[PDB]
Amino acid sequence: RSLNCTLRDSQQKSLVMSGPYELKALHLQGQDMEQQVVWSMSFVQGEESNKIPVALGLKEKNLYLSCVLKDDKPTLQLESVDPKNYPKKKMEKRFVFNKIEINNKLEFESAQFPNFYISTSQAENMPVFLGGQDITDFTMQFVS
């Protein structure tokens, strides 16, 4: 099961590629919006509640957000996967985020690293990371 969408932070910053395996966030409006990443948010197995477990993959690309230790700290990366095996329901835990609806916003908690969240900086054109000054609330926009 999946939804096609874009995500913006609570400062209306869009998400764009930073190199092949990272994302950055910045203020896009008009024609430059086409720069933004389009996601396939898949609804995967995992504990749920009225926290929904999801995976965040680039739509039609075999690249998924995932949470790993890098320099011994929880780190957000885009990770290549075998296109014959994805998407799937039972995604590996590094790829799972608990989607939380709070105050008409969304937060994405790492399933591998409890209470670490997809975050953006206030400053322009900085990496999206795993983590209050920083931003952890998003809105979703559906796309066809």
Domain boundaries, the chain: 1-144
Residues 6 or more apart whose Cβ sits within 8 Å of residue 7: 15, 37, 39, 106, 138, 139, 140, 141
Query: Quick check: helix, strand or coil at residue 24?
Result: strand
65 closest CA partner among 135, 121, 7, 12? 7
Assign 99 to helix, strand or coil. strand
**In this structure, what token pair is assigned to residue 30?**
């008009």
Pairing of strands 73-80, 63-70: antiparallel
Burial 107-143 (b: 16+ CB within 10 A, else e): bbbbbbbeebbbbbbeeeeeebbbbeeebbbbeeeee
**What is the rounded CA–CA span in Å between residue 19 and residue 11?**
23
Angstrom distance (rounded) from CA 101 to CA 51:
8
Cβ contact 92:102 at 8 Å: no
What's this structure's resolution in Å?
A: 1.5
Q: 3-state DSSP call for residue 63? A: strand
The experimental method behind these coordinates is X-ray
Second-level CATH architecture of 1-144? Trefoil (2.80)
Residue 137 near residue 124, CB atoms below 8 Å: no
- CA 81 to chain CA centroid, Å, is 16
